[PDB]
Motif scaffolding. Structure first.
Motif, PDB file in Angstrom:
ATOM      1  N   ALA A  16       0.825  -1.476  -0.155  1.00  0.00           N
ATOM      2  CA  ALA A  16       0.200  -0.596   0.217  1.00  0.00           C
ATOM      3  C   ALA A  16       1.003   1.410   0.013  1.00  0.00           C
ATOM      4  O   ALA A  16       1.830   1.069   0.878  1.00  0.00           O
ATOM      5  N   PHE A  47       9.934   4.736   7.656  1.00  0.00           N
ATOM      6  CA  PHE A  47       8.419   4.436   6.460  1.00  0.00           C
ATOM      7  C   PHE A  47       9.165   3.134   5.665  1.00  0.00           C
ATOM      8  O   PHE A  47       8.404   3.860   4.240  1.00  0.00           O
ATOM      9  N   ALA A  84       7.853  -1.666   0.280  1.00  0.00           N
ATOM     10  CA  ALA A  84       8.402  -2.273   0.285  1.00  0.00           C
ATOM     11  C   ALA A  84       9.301  -1.928  -0.610  1.00  0.00           C
ATOM     12  O   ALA A  84      10.062  -2.594  -1.482  1.00  0.00           O
ATOM     13  N   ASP A  92      11.094   0.028   9.842  1.00  0.00           N
ATOM     14  CA  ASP A  92       9.169   0.095  10.273  1.00  0.00           C
ATOM     15  C   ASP A  92       8.867  -0.267  11.230  1.00  0.00           C
ATOM     16  O   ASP A  92       9.571  -1.224  11.927  1.00  0.00           O
ATOM     17  N   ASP A 138       7.759   8.942   4.596  1.00  0.00           N
ATOM     18  CA  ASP A 138       6.183   8.377   3.812  1.00  0.00           C
ATOM     19  C   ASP A 138       5.451   7.961   4.392  1.00  0.00           C
ATOM     20  O   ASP A 138       5.466   6.957   4.328  1.00  0.00           O
TER      21      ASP A 138
HETATM   22  N1  LIG Z   1       4.979   4.867  13.749  1.00  0.00           N
HETATM   23  C1  LIG Z   1       5.180   4.171  12.810  1.00  0.00           C
HETATM   24  N2  LIG Z   1       6.820   3.665  12.360  1.00  0.00           N
HETATM   25  C2  LIG Z   1       7.114   3.436  11.974  1.00  0.00           C
HETATM   26  N3  LIG Z   1       6.921   3.026  10.424  1.00  0.00           N
HETATM   27  C3  LIG Z   1       5.366   3.281  10.572  1.00  0.00           C
HETATM   28  C4  LIG Z   1       4.466   3.692  11.628  1.00  0.00           C
HETATM   29  N4  LIG Z   1       2.953   3.589  11.372  1.00  0.00           N
HETATM   30  C5  LIG Z   1       3.172   2.653  10.271  1.00  0.00           C
HETATM   31  N5  LIG Z   1       4.372   2.994   9.636  1.00  0.00           N
HETATM   32  C6  LIG Z   1       4.427   1.909   8.365  1.00  0.00           C
HETATM   33  O1  LIG Z   1       4.693   3.049   6.885  1.00  0.00           O
HETATM   34  C7  LIG Z   1       5.058   2.619   6.511  1.00  0.00           C
HETATM   35  C8  LIG Z   1       3.719   3.485   4.758  1.00  0.00           C
HETATM   36  C9  LIG Z   1       4.157   3.441   3.857  1.00  0.00           C
HETATM   37  N6  LIG Z   1       2.775   3.849   2.892  1.00  0.00           N
HETATM   38  C10 LIG Z   1       5.663   3.361   3.196  1.00  0.00           C
HETATM   39  C11 LIG Z   1       5.564   2.938   1.358  1.00  0.00           C
HETATM   40  C12 LIG Z   1       6.650   3.075   1.033  1.00  0.00           C
HETATM   41  N7  LIG Z   1       7.422   4.199   0.372  1.00  0.00           N
HETATM   42  C13 LIG Z   1       6.748   2.219  -0.092  1.00  0.00           C
HETATM   43  O2  LIG Z   1       7.482   2.596  -1.432  1.00  0.00           O
HETATM   44  O3  LIG Z   1       6.680   0.801  -0.139  1.00  0.00           O
HETATM   45  C14 LIG Z   1       3.581   1.127   6.258  1.00  0.00           C
HETATM   46  O4  LIG Z   1       4.698  -0.115   5.741  1.00  0.00           O
HETATM   47  C15 LIG Z   1       3.606   1.443   7.670  1.00  0.00           C
HETATM   48  O5  LIG Z   1       3.848  -0.572   8.520  1.00  0.00           O
END
Ligand SMILES: Nc1ncnc2c1ncn2[C@@H]1O[C@H](C[C@@H](N)CC[C@H](N)C(=O)O)[C@@H](O)[C@H]1O
Length: 254
Positions: A9, A33, A36, A52, A179
């Motif tokens: 996502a 964050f 993938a 993460d 992100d």
């Molecule tokens: N408090 C938190 N601290 C660190 N990561 C988090 C937190 N809450 C949610 N996330 C993670 O932030 C990520 C958000 C994603 N949209 C990032 C996508 C990434 N940029 C990609 O290219 O795949 C998710 O995988 C979450 O598991």
DNA sequence: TCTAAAGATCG
DNA sequence: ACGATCTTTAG
């Protein structure tokens, strides 16, 4: 252009050209964050720190890096015609949730990402995975993408922790890209309180001559959180009905 | 984004 | 032992 081996996502593959236009240069890149990993896979720094909150994801990345040939041969056996069936899918999901061996859990995690409903990731309050069967026609086994990931990872370290703790690892030769999960478009998960605290930490880093770049939707709320940065509008006009564009914010020191 | 069953919370 | 109103679960 290189592809991740997981469905996910908010993946950033389609926006890479705009990100690379504004991202500063340096020795080390930090991603609080990571998900993938589309940005890590398409840049050229000499060192990386990647983090993460999801602990099943971080454990899988350690196995793929250190035990590559053994992992590929075992996972290939689950991608055959015999396993594309509902009764078989629900027994493998049950084996995953009951196992206590890191290598076996990692093998099964990839099967579930590629045969499950719309490619989702979802859990209950006890920590059990509970997405249902997906019914695709012929899923693909990402062999090429797995070897390339292992090769680039020889220059990175991985951690399971929250955004305040990973951002504190940065020093005077680093660059940071954030992100977070998307802001809401109308009135448990990432809270409003948390979206604002992230912006506060960025303002403190830039005082120390450490540069930072952030991404999110373009709304009234985000323009207020990121007021002390320079802002760039990215036209996308995605329906639903109304159009919404994206936004990039850059904190640069003097 | 959706909904029929089961469990949580207070006076 | 009671009942109105929320949360939580998983196809
Ligand atoms: N408090 C938190 N601290 C660190 N990561 C988090 C937190 N809450 C949610 N996330 C993670 O932030 C990520 C958000 C994603 N949209 C990032 C996508 C990434 N940029 C990609 O290219 O795949 C998710 O995988 C979450 O598991």
């Amino acid at each position: 252009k290189n592809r991740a081996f997981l469905k996910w996502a908010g993946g950033k593959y389609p926006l890479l050209d705009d990100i690379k236009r504004h991202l500063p240069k340096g020795e080390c890149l930090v991603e609080p964050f990571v998900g993938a990993g589309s940005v890590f896979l398409n840049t050229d720094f000499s060192r990386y720190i990647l983090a993460d909150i999801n602990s099943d994801l971080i454990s899988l990345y350690n196995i793929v890096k250190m035990r590559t040939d053994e992992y590929v041969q075992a996972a290939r056996e689950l991608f055959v015609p015999e396993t594309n069936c509902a009764e078989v899918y629900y027994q493998f999901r049950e084996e995953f949730n009951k196992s206590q061996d890191p290598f076996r859990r990692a093998v099964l995690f990839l099967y579930l990402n590629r045969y499950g409903y719309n490619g989702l990731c979802r859990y209950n309050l006890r920590g059990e995975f509970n997405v249902p069967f997906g019914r695709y026609k012929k899923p693909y086994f990402p062999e090429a993408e797995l070897y390339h990931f292992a090769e680039k990872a020889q220059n990175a370290f991985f951690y399971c922790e929250s955004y305040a703790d990973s951002m504190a690892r940065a020093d005077d030769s680093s660059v940071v890209y954030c992100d977070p999960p998307y802001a809401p478009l109308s009135a448990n998960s990432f809270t409003l309180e948390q979206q604002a605290h992230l912006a506060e930490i960025a303002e403190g880093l830039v005082e120390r001559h450490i540069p930072v770049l952030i991404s999110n939707h373009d709304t009234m709320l985000t323009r207020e959180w990121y007021q002390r940065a320079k802002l760039h509008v990215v036209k996308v006009r995605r329906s639903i009905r109304k159009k919404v564009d994206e936004l990039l914010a850059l904190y640069k020191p003097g």
